[PDB]
Structures are given as structure tokens and as C-alpha cells.
Amino acid sequence: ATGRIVAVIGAVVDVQFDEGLPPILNALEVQGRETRLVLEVAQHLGESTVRTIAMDGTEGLVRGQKVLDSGAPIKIPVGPETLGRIMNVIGEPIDERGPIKTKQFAAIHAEAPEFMEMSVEQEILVTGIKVVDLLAPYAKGGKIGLFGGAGVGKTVLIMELINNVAKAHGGYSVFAGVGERTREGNDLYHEMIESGVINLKDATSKVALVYGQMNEPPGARARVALTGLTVAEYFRDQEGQDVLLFIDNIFRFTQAGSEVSALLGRIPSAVGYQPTLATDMGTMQERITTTKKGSITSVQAIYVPADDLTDPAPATTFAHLDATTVLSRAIAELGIYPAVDPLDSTSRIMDPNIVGSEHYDVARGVQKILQDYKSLQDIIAILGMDELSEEDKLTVSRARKIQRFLSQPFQVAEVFTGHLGKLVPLKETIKGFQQILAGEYDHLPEQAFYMVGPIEEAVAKADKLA
């Protein structure tokens, strides 16, 4: 079947066929271009006419050009041969090392796992960061969010989780860059070569990379998160392994659907997004699950626009997560890195059965002394410190050291300040918050608790300022 391009409006191309109307989600091929322009059927308008969405720039299309139906959805090369390579939206090698040679091909638009395939196992994934071990612990095989504004650390943190968790992992890894800096994607490819994760001489590489960046058209950022997902479905289903799935950033999948929803002729909903906003996120996000064959451990990174957590795009992804780490800027101004909100970070496995009865009791004492300090900030700012009680000059004097003890020097931020990266075990971040909540360290200043590892370096710092 061949068709004629009838209307080109931005990044939405219209096509009229004469026989053989292709069904929805089929790919088409445009005839007469130097590169490869591939469309994607999105509607049927009647009078034997479809309406597509283009996956590259539509500069130079004449009304009457010929387009050829492929007969099937977009199929990318998948397998263990795609490890150690880079792939674009339609699965072509963009690393100038030759074609990707596999045996089988998998479509992009696949359906979700059923009800009788969901596994109900819950474990704990210890990371090494004091704030996310204690107050919101991470589960193996479940989704993980990372909320925050623009400039708080949603990528210095996600490159620390790669440095700790994914390097010592035994399974496979998949990175999918949706709408970030292209100079950052060059640095990730050039750090995994020196650290030996990707190897260009033999066949012992452990991570695949998928990339559709911020200089891409809106039709190619709205479909690249389905490509880095379909690569990580082979490593779970047809091999039976434990994978990791880092996506950054997932808001660009939502933003780039609103750019093209105006051109498709729709009535727009609230603050400016598409009407089908929560229908097509649930269709995407219910394909990243731990089923009865393997475990997908997705660590996403979500962007909050204009620091507003009531915006419909970062407030409809809260129903799809197990853990949650809300970053904030007002903590990052004081110099507390990572600037994790302690009273807004939630978790699902926080339960006295799974994590214990000793972990659960110290973690709830920390959220109690930090909430009572938050209710006195309206009075300390007006009437000063000398108007409180005597027992309430101890909630203030202890919460101002737990706040500074939730700071930690990261490993990837060695080139920022020149301090050593520190890692703590889970059994030692329980002991550090007992010897502060009890009152063992009421003879030290607050700045001695600033940017250290475990509790033993806090007393090895207060002897300096003597």
C-alpha cells in the first residue's frame, strides 16, 4: 500500500491512502529522502485518511510525496548482542561501530502483564546513603521515584546509585536517557569504558544505552521511553534475570505529549496538558513490573516544574511508586546535600514486620523531633530564642544536629569540593540516631556533625575546633 502526504503541520504529518488502510500503531516509510523518516499511525479520520506522528524533522516534505507501509509496528533489535551499544528511538546504531546483529525482533507497543503474573515479594535494597536507608528504604523489585526542581541534585544522586548498586550487581542494566543534556550522555559512555562496564574488544559488557535527547523532535521523545523498556523486557522474560532500569528524565515523556496534542485537534484539560494525561501514563508505567519470571528494579528521576508539587504531571505519578524521595531547594540553600525532605519522603516497606522493631522505632523518633521543630519556626523568627521553655531549648538544640547528620559527602561529587566519598552500612545508621536522640552527644557543636560518614568521625571533628 502506498499513500500521498496531504498536510504537514509541524511535527504531525497527514497521509491519505487509496487502498489498504493500515491499522493504528503501524510504522510507515517515506520514499525519497536521504535519511530514514518513519511515521507512526495515530488516528483514523475517515474518507480513507490517517493521521501520523513523525519521528524526525519534517523539513522538506512536498504535498504529494509517496509513503510506503511497513505492515507492522516499530521493531528494534533485541537480545544479548545489544549490550554495550547505543541505540536511538528506532533501534539504529548511533555509536559508529557497525550494525547490531541479532536474530529476533520485538515490537515497541506490547501489552501489560496480567493479574495472575504479579509477584508479591518484598525485600530491602540497602544503598549506603543515610537519609534513604533510615526514613524511606528501598525495595528490590519495586519502582523508585526521585522528585525535585531544577538544580537540586536529581542527577548527582542518580549517578551515585549507579556507582553503589549497579556496579556490584550480578545481573544486567539498562540506561534510557529521555530529554537530558547530550554532553552528559557522552560522559556516561566515556566513564563506563574506563571503569570496564562496557568493553569494546570482547563480549563481557553489562549495560545497554538508549538515547533520545533534548534536541530531538517531540515525536521522538514521546516514544524513546518505550524503547528502553522493550530492551529490558527480553532480559526479564526470555532469559529470566534480575535487571536494573534507570530512566532519566521521565517528565519529558509527559511534556512531549502535550506539544503534539494541540496539533492533533483536541480540547485541552487543566493547566495546559493533554486530556489523555493519566490514561497513557498508566499504559506505559504498568509495563515496568516484577512478574513471576524476573525482577525489574526501576529507578526513575522525575522533574517538578516551577517547584509546584500540585502540577498534574508530578502529581499523577505518585500513584505508581513504592518509594519516594522528594528533593527540595530550601534545604539545598543551607548546604545540606543531598537535600532530601525528611517529612515528605515516604516508603511502602516501612512496616515493623519487614524492617524490624528496632529500625522502625528509631526512624519514627527522628520524624517526631523534626516535626516539633517545624512548629516552632513561626515563633523563633519573631520573638527569638530567649522566649521558649527550658525543655524546648532541647528539641531545637537536638533537631539542629539531626538535620546536619542527614548530610553526606557523595562519591561522584569528589570533583566539586575535593572531599572523600563516604559509604555507611545499614547497621551503623541505626546506631548514629540512637546516640543523638538519647542525649549522648550534648557537648558538641552542630558544625562538628557536618558532612561526615558514620558517628565516629563526628567526635573526631569536634577535637579540631577546640
Next chain:
Amino acid sequence: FAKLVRPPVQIYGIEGRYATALYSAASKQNKLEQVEKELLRVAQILKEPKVAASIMNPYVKRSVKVKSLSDMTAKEKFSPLTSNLINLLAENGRLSSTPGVISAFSTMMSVHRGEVPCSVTTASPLDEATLTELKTVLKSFLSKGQILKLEVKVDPSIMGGMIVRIGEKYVDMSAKTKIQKLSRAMR
């Protein structure tokens, strides 16, 4: 662009845009009477169950509904500019509104000799002397050299009077002279 001649009625709508564009091409080349005799027979040859079907049926195509009409208007009588009109109505999907274009064109061509007829709505039809007297005083009112047409309707709700319209004039001598008795109340 070029200029186009204005019709003396100037109606509006999607059917008036096609009765004006034909009047701006048939007043040129002096063919305003040849199209009118053709258009009163294309109204007959559309409303046949072989041809009234598969023109409103949306599941055929655009192009094969043209070819089934490009030979139908070619073989019988027509090869004027009007064969492009049926060719243009079938391209734009406006083949359903073809009685709307035809019925608009007759009144647009009527006013070239017509008079926008009257309406006398009083009662049962009366004798001949009352009819010829109103037909020979209304001829004195037009002052345009055009033989006026007229319609008579029966409406018994008016008590003893009659209302008369001449185009857009509408004199009135009816039961509204009973409603003018509010001067006994409103004063």
C-alpha cells in the same frame, strides 16, 4: 484576482457561495438562460434510486464518485462551463447540497424579472372583481415593468380584515385594530 459581478439578491451560506460563483460566470458570456434550463433538469436526474444512492453513501471513494458522474453529465446533453460545476461539487464533498444550490439559483434568476410576490391572508376566496382590482392597483405600485406574481392563503384567525405584503412592505388592516383598544385602559 479578477472582479466578479454582484447578484441582485446576495444571499449567504455555503449554498449562496455556489449560486454566486455561477452567477459571476454565466452573466459573463451571456449564458444566464442556458444554465437555468439545464439546472431544472439536473434536479430531475439526481433523485433516482440508482443515482440518489451512492452519492450520500460515504463508503465508496471520492474519485469513483466523480467518474460515475463525469460521464453522466457528458453523454446526455451538457458540455458547458456547468459540467465543471458538478465536477467541483463532487471534489469538495458538497454533492449533498446540490438541491440547495439549484433552488437558490432560481430565485437569484427570478429577480432579473421577478417581483417578490405578495401574501393576502384573510378568508375564503372571493369573487373575480375583487381579485382583478387588487392585481391592477399593485401593478401601479411596482413601477418596474415586471408582471407581478401573487399567492393567496386562508387564515380565519383574523376577524374581518386582511394583511398585504409587497416585497418587504407589509401594510396591515386586521384584528390588531382590536388590540389598539388599550387606549381605553392604558390611556
Next chain:
Amino acid sequence: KTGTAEVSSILEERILGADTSVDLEETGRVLSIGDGIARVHGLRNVQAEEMVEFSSGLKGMSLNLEPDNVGVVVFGNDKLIKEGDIVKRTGAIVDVPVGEELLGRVVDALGNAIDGKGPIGSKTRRRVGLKAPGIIPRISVREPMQTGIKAVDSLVPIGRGQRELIIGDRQTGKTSIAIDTIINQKRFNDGTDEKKKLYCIYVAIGQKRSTVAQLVKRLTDADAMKYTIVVSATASDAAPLQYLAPYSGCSMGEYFRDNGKHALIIYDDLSKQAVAYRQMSLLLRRPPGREAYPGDVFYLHSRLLERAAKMNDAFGGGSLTALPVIETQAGDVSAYIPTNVISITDGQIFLETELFYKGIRPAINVGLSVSRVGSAAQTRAMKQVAGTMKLELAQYREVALDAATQQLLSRGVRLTELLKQGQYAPMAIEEQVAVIYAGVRGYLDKLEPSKITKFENAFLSHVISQHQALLGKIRADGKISEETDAKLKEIVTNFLAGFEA
């Protein structure tokens, strides 16, 4: 459902015979005009984003192709166009003249001279709608790009290929950072080492026309208009000419990057571009979003600032540095537009409006100014000294008769006054490293704070003369060795004995 081309002037061409003396393949008419775009009937072989020409002499871009008509975005004013015109098809995508033969001119956004010096003499044309380089050809930054400002070159260092924001309110000294970057390249463009040459491009969006004219004099007064291009779409120009101004400005810098040369471009400013793209969007009846902006403002500034990159050695080895300018309303760094550009560029420079009033100039907020990738690419002479001043400017900021407080409150004010700088005085790299040396090695700790602007203007004016041949080994060897710093100890302590307090 009434159709744009269902009018009687187009039905008459069809109903009176399919007319032969109308082209309808390379030329068409104009059906309507007035909201910006024009509705052009015909032109059945036009491409998308292809420049056309009107009968009045105006260029227009083919934006929106439909089965009836074409919507042409009109560059310039739309009074000159009338319904019923005839528009010709050029046959090429929107492109600008580009080459080495533009250094010294003042063009407008379409590539025509407005300085009154005749034609330009160009031979090559590049498109404005090209894509950024991918992941393979780029490489990390390694060469430093000097500024000549003592607060920027030692605290937020820049490198050849790194985006850097300049963000602040009105009248805080935004443009006067961008001017001193262009004048500081006089020392390198007039030398023999070709590997350190650097050109410049200035893009003026929405400014006044009388402020660009008083700017090209200041560059001509300092011999800086022989390696600088200026693109100009001022506030009286039409709205499509301000939208397409940084694209034509960046396509003139992409020439030098692909041919082994280094470029530099200053967009001034990207705030007034986004209020020009807002106008063309709402005049096309598009759904507004936050602050009545369109939904694709992020596509506007990301597809432009992704081009500023550094190629690898197999692609020539050139670069392209960008320095956009954003204006905030009363310190609002949490609005829609100043967060869409913080989440693109590789760092920030903050200009406070309440340090510009207290007499500190340039009013650089040292707490909120960061530069991530450009810290590893600076001179080891500067890193050996400015790595120490980074510590004391931190310890001054926590303490804002006690012990361990009146020591840091003494030194921390002598380093704040050391970082003031007069206008249009770009310093060299090796003259900075002696003045920052005296403030961090503990020599001016005894002086009064008011008599330290007098001290820097007296020490530099003499060591540039009597120790000129002994200063060159800092710039030549690129570092401070054990023989230079033992020599530098005697230059200062002999000058303080002669400097009359």
C-alpha cells in the same frame, strides 16, 4: 466547516474553465493577511520551512502546509502586503550568508547589512534549522576561555565549549560582563599562536536601537570590531525577526566550529525572545500554559543551546561557547522561564540588585554561582591560588569580640574588596595571579579596608614595568614553581615598605 478556499474568487477560476494562464505550481496568490501569517492559495510544490518572496520584497517562511492553502510567517512588517498579491517560490530552506568575510559588519537577522558599507561578499550558505551533533563527535572541555574579570576567572571558571548563564534583574551589570569578554580577546587575536584565536558574535534581541549604536563605538574605540559580528533585531522590528535572530546568529558560529576555529556568541537576551514566540503562538490560537506561554517553549531554547559543543580531534577540534542572558523580575529564580534555562546550561552566574546598590561592582553572588564542567579546564597557576580563596570566602559566610570570628571577619572583607573591578579594564591572566596572591598569602592583613583599592592600582602599575621580564615565566610555563613563589615573596614585601599608608 466552511473552507478557507471556498470563496467566490477561487470558485470562479474553476467554474469558468480550468484556466491556463495561472501557474499554481511555483507561484500563488494571497487570500488574507493581518495577524502575522498570510493565507496563500496555490504553491503546490512548496516544501516545509522554505523561504518564499513576496511582490513587495519581503521574505517569508513556509510554516504550515494544508490541503487548501499555505500559511506563511512574514518577516518584517505586514502593512506592505495586500490581498491579491503574487508570491514566488525561492526553492531553498531558510538559510543565511556565512563566512570569514563578515567580521566587521552589522547585519540584521536575515543577513543584510544595515551599517551602510555595501554588500558583504559571501560564498557559502548554511541552514538555520540544523540539528546538534550527537554523542560520538563531542568530547569534554579542556581549553580555558579567559574573561578578564577577577571575580569570574577565579571563582566560576569558563572553558571553550561550556554553556554559562548570566541571570539577574535590570541594571545590575549584565551586558558589561559580555562586553569585557570581547575586548579581552585583543591579546590573542593579534598574536602568532593560531591555536588560541577566538572570534565573537553578538545578538541583540528586543533592545533599543540607540544602545547598539553606542556599543559598536566602544568596540571600535578599543580595536575590537575587526573580529566581531553583530546581529541585531531591536525592539521596533517585527516579532518573527526576533524569534529567528539567535538561529541565524548561531549558524554563523557553526561555520568556525566545523573548520577548526573557536567562536563565542552572546545572546542578549533570551527573555525577550520567549515573549516574541508567545505572541506568534497566541495569534495562531494555540492553547496557552503556565503564564500564558505555549507548550513548546522548552523546544525553543534546547534546540538552540544544544549546538554549542566541542568537537573531537577527528572532526577538526573547534568549539562553540554560548552565554545567554535571562532577566528576572525581583529576584524570582523560581519562575517558568528562568528554570527552563537553568535545566539546560552548565552553570550559573548571579547578579544581585542589592549588592549593586551597596557599591560592590560587579555584584556577583559568590554563594549561588557555580560552574560544573568548566572547573577542570583552567590554568594551574590560577588553580594554585584561587583554590585557597574558595576556602576563606566560605568561612566569611557563616559568621554573618569573640574568638575565631574576628579573624575571619578581618580577612573576609579584604578579599571582598580585592574582587572589585572597574569598567572596560580587562586584565590578563598572569596579572590576576599576583593580586590574588597578595590577598590569600597574608600580606595585606594589616591595612585599612578603605585603602585597598588604592593598593591594587599601585602594585600592578609597577610590577608591570620593573618586573615585566620576570612576570612572563608565569604565563609561559603556566604554573607557579618553587623559584617563582620564592621570587614573588620579595616583590610584595619590598613594595609594602615603600607604599605610603
